[PDB]
Amino acid sequence: ASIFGVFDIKTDAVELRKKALELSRLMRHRGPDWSGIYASDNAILAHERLSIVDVNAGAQPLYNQQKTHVLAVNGEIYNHQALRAEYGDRYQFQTGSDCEVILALYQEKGPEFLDDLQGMFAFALYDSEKDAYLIGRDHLGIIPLYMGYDEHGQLYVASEMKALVPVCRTIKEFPAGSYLWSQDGEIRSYYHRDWFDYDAVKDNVTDKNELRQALEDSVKSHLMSDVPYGVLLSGGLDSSIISAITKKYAAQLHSFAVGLPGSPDLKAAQEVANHLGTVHHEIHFTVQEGLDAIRDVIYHIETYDVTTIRASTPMYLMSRKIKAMGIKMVLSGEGSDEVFGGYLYFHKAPNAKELHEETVRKLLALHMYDCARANKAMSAWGVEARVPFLDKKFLDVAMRINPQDKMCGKMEKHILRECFEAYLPASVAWRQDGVGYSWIDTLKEVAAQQVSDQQLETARFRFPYNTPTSKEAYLYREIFEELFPLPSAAECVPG
């Protein structure tokens, strides 16, 4: 879904509403199902839905029973069932939407219920009674959210920067693990955990069976949906586990892998799918198909980062292929490397202290990284991506085991392999460019054509911020800028 909100209105609200319709529509690929808008003299909440749960009645914006509170959410509240039970006493549910609990929660706790939600999301809520608003983003910013200001000082928020660039003088990412309560006027962090610090877990007790079961429960809970769903299977450990787990609790399970015809990963993926027994779909794309998509990928992910761009491409095309099949949601394996210190550089880790701090740090930066890519790549085509490895509960267990246990002094994510070896082929289980070498190669080769050594030499004059230092980056930048003129838009991009 997409969310779009305008707060602190100081102008013709009428005109603003007309404009909101326009800007919201810019993100309609995220919510192809239906459009919703709420507009008053003091606030606007525009919504583009992708119905996953409560098809018929999960229409948004969701309204107060009394109709004084209005909510627009992009996300999934996994524990909503539990919450309905708990507050159902106090609040009158109007639908079956998982998102409705935020409305219950707010009614009783005001702005203080963020850590009570389990799931991924971004929302904007408007209380006509108190003439107040609340904006929030999940714990690690799994669901993206941007914010910015008009030349009037009016406040804007949108799932994608794409809808703000046209009106804001400034924009920035809506901080993850946080909320914005109008009465307070300041963004406050709500997500904190003991494990944020080493000295907190340092001599903890690792419980493998706990770890495994934790990931199982995460997956299980992320299976919530009223539409057809699938799993991304790349043949890598992370998606192999997710798919394995998913297969395990699916009770027809579709798997998807993407790549240049004949590439290695494809083979791995096929192997796993065959071992797990899923109805696999090997998506192929040609190098030219990828080239031709670059610009749109860039418009979708909203970045000029080479690596992200190179990687979102395939994902972007896989998504179009999935959606065409009719699948609206998929589970993926992002977060695993960050939780378990999956990177090779982690092999090189100095000690458990260093390891821990790095992973934490990595977890806290994901909203700008893997999260953004997955979400936006998939949403380009109206496909929802779930990340069980990043589930709230799971993380507490995985971040709380002893971090020595994460040290490679073994395969990189040993403990994890150990936990699921049984579910997989020995090959993936203990394995340590699969989409196609040619993919990045032509990429590079095309950049070198399109970019003069001259351009590169004086890039600092053109792109003073995060000056591109290679012709490929140079190329992605030009397009980025072309699409996202505003100077702060590039500052959202990690320097």
Instruction: List contacts with a second copy (CB under 8 A).
Output: 21-22, 25, 32-35, 37, 51, 289, 292-293, 295-296, 320-321, 323-324, 326, 381
Cβ–Cβ < 8 Å for 416, 336? yes
Q: Does 236 bind ligand AMP (CB under 6 A)?
A: yes
Closest to 3 measured CA to CA, from 127, 126, 128: 126
Binding ligand AMP by CB under 6 A: which of 257, 329, 355, 451? 257
Query: What does the alpha-carbon distance between residue 486 and residue 59 come to, in Å, rounded to a whole number?
Result: 33
Minimal distance, residue 351 CB to a second copy, in Å = 50
- 144's tokens: 């993206």
CB 402 within 8 A of CB 204: yes
Q: Which amino acid is at 62?
A: L
Binding partner of residue 259 among a second copy, ligand IUM, ligand AMP, none, CB cut-off 5 to 8 Å per kind: ligand AMP
Residue 319 binds ligand AMP, judged by CB under 6 A:
no
Nearest to 417 by CA among 242, 220, 237, 274: 237
Neighbouring C-beta atoms of residue 213, cutoff 10 Å: 14
The residues in 429-458 that bind ligand AMP, with binding defined as CB under 6 A, are: 434-435
52 contributes a contact to ligand GLN by CB under 6 A: yes
User: Out of 23, 135, 163, 233, which residue is the one contacting ligand AMP (CB under 6 A)?
Assistant: 233
Angle at 76 between CA 72 and CA 78, to 5 degrees: 135
Q: Which one among 6, 27, 53, 415 touches ligand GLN, defined by CB under 6 A?
A: 53
Contact partner at residue 52 from ligand AMP, a second copy, ligand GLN, none, CB < 5 to 8 Å by partner kind: ligand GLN
Partner interacting with residue 76 (select from ligand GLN, Cl ion, a second copy, none; CB below 5-8 Å by kind): ligand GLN
- Interatomic CA distance for residues 377 and 380, integer angstroms: 5
Beta bridge partners of 75: 121
Min CB(457)–a second copy separation in Å? 24
Give 170 or 466: the residue with its C-beta nearer to Cl ion.
170
What's the min distance (Å) between Cβ of 99 and ligand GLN? 5
Instruction: Assess 259 for contact with ligand AMP (CB under 6 A).
Output: yes
Q: Which is nearer to ligand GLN, 374 or 459 (CB)?
A: 374
Q: Which stretch binds ligand AMP (CB under 6 A): 81-89, 122-130, 255-263, 284-292?
A: 255-263
Residue 301 is given by DSSP the state I
How far is it, in rounded angstroms, from Cα 367 to Cα 126? 25
Q: 2-7 and 34-39: which strand pairing? A: unpaired
Beta bridge partners of residue 71, listed in sequence order = 62, 125
Task: Report the nearest approach of a second copy to the CB of residue 390 (Å).
Answer: 28
- Both tokens assigned to 468: 């591109």
Residue 388 binds ligand AMP (CB under 6 A): no
Binding to ligand IUM (CB under 6 A) within 316-335 occurs at 333-335
Contact residue for ligand GLN among 5, 36, 61, 75 (CB under 6 A): 75
Asked if residue 443 lies in contact with residue 310, where contact means CB atoms within 8 angstroms, the answer is yes
User: Residue 329's beta-bridge partner residues?
Assistant: 229, 384
Check residue 333 for interaction with ligand AMP (CB under 6 A). yes
Q: What is the phi-psi region of residue 235: left when phi exceeds 0, alpha when psi lies from -120 to 50, beta otherwise?
A: left
Beta bridge partners of 156: 6, 148
Contact between 412 and ligand IUM per CB under 6 A: no
C-alpha dihedral sign at 360, 361, 364, 365: negative
Among 24, 64, 79, 97, binds ligand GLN (CB under 6 A): 97
Contact positions vs ligand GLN (CB under 6 A) = 1, 49-54, 58, 74-76, 97-99, 384
Using CB under 6 A, list all residues that contact ligand AMP. 232-234, 236, 238-239, 256-259, 265, 332-334, 337, 370, 434-435
